[PDB]
Amino acid sequence: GPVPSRARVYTDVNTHRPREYWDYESHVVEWGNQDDYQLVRKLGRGKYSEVFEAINITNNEKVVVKILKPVKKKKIKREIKILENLRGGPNIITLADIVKDRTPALVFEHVNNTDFKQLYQTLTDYDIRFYMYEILKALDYCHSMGIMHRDVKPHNVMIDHEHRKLRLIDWGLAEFYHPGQEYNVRVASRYFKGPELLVDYQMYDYSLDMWSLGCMLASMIFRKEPFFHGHDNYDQLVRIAKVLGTEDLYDYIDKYNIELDPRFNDILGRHSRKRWERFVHSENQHLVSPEALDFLDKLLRYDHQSRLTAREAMEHPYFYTVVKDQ
Ligand SMILES: O=C(O)c1ccc2c(c1)nc(NCc1ccccc1)c1ncncc12
């Protein structure tokens, strides 16, 4: 069978807290009055929810209402408990209320958001460093509170550029870390899936988010959204293998004694690890620096234990200018 793994950091945080902190199944939910909010317009549609701009007729505060489509009550309780636990934390979206009418809905703070299609073509080298630092604050915080996001991607990072403000949203896939627990690998968007997910290693941890952040950084500095552009879950790993090389991939398999799908045996093949200069061009030259490449390299690793933590990431030279300015 596979070899066990544990997080390098924040390993036993949830064990040291009261049961009710993480035992979300036993969370009783108190439904506020749905008549307090009037829906203005639809902001977005997804698989599991719809999102609307709304007004709160009590205090005329602008608000966002996320009407949940049918999901197991367990996962609603989970998203709510995580949001309440993380409420007040740096760059974490604030859950304001919970209502229904008998479909459940989550009420959130309103945030102005620049279209990340229109925005990621206009970011300076500094802006990327800045917002990356802001994301790391959120990731380090939730990791320290014993929580994996498991869906870090451009969509779930809302940026108010005018106010240099950033919020990490959509904690519907987030889970509590527990040492020894085997998790569902069918999580995250395909382009941001860590190798642990793609090879079906279930005993993963916070470090999963750091891989996803690496995919985000890669796309930003190299101007390729997405960076690893797989046609399916199998091909996704091939795209990675064509960059990170296959030597390290198989060492990862051997180390953790992972039972690799026989399908992969055919299509992975033998690929060398590529230098990052390959993805540098005239257009993306101004965003790429020796620091950025060092930082990115230490994020994007097969072995999840060998990736940077969020706090380690924050101490990297990449962010020296940003740290000084605050
Ligand atoms: O699920 C959540 O945790 C959550 C929390 C807050 C918001 C949200 C989702 N979605 C918003 N808008 C839809 C959207 C967001 C980004 C790109 C495209 C569409 C939104 N808008 C303004 N203020 C807040 C939010």
From Swiss-Prot:
One of its GO terms (cellular component) is PML body. It is found in: Nucleus. Residues 37-319 form the Protein kinase domain. The keyword Lipid metabolism does not apply. Constitutively active protein kinase whose activity is not directly affected by phosphorylation. Seems to be regulated by level of expression and localization. One of its GO terms (molecular function) is ATP binding. Phosphorylation does not directly affect casein kinase 2 activity, but may contribute to its regulation by forming binding sites for interacting proteins and/or targeting it to different compartments. Its EC number is 2.7.11.1. It catalyses: L-seryl-[protein] + ATP = O-phospho-L-seryl-[protein] + ADP + H(+); L-threonyl-[protein] + ATP = O-phospho-L-threonyl-[protein] + ADP + H(+). ATP binds at residues 43-51, 66. The active site is at 151 (proton acceptor). One of its GO terms (biological process) is positive regulation of cell population proliferation. Residues 34-39 are annotated as: Interaction with beta subunit. Heterotetramer composed of two catalytic subunits (alpha chain and/or alpha' chain) and two regulatory subunits (beta chains). The tetramer can exist as a combination of 2 alpha/2 beta, 2 alpha'/2 beta or 1 alpha/1 alpha'/2 beta subunits. Also part of a CK2-SPT16-SSRP1 complex composed of SSRP1, SUPT16H, CSNK2A1, CSNK2A2 and CSNK2B, which forms following UV irradiation. Interacts with RNPS1. Interacts with SNAI1. Interacts with PML (isoform PML-12). Interacts with CCAR2. Interacts with HIRIP3. Belongs to the protein kinase superfamily. Ser/Thr protein kinase family. CK2 subfamily. Can use both ATP and GTP as phosphoryl donors. Phosphorylation by casein kinase 2 has been estimated to represent up to one quarter of the eukaryotic phosphoproteome. Casein kinase 2 has been found to be increased at protein level and up-regulated at the level of enzyme activity in the majority of cancers. However, elevated levels of casein kinase 2 are present in certain normal organs such as brain and testes. Catalytic subunit of a constitutively active serine/threonine-protein kinase complex that phosphorylates a large number of substrates containing acidic residues C-terminal to the phosphorylated serine or threonine. Regulates numerous cellular processes, such as cell cycle progression, apoptosis and transcription, as well as viral infection. May act as a regulatory node which integrates and coordinates numerous signals leading to an appropriate cellular response. It is linked to Okur-Chung neurodevelopmental syndrome: An autosomal dominant neurodevelopmental disorder characterized by developmental delay, intellectual disability, behavioral problems, hypotonia, speech problems, microcephaly, pachygyria and variable dysmorphic features. This is Casein kinase II subunit alpha. It comes from Homo sapiens (Human). The gene is CSNK2A1.
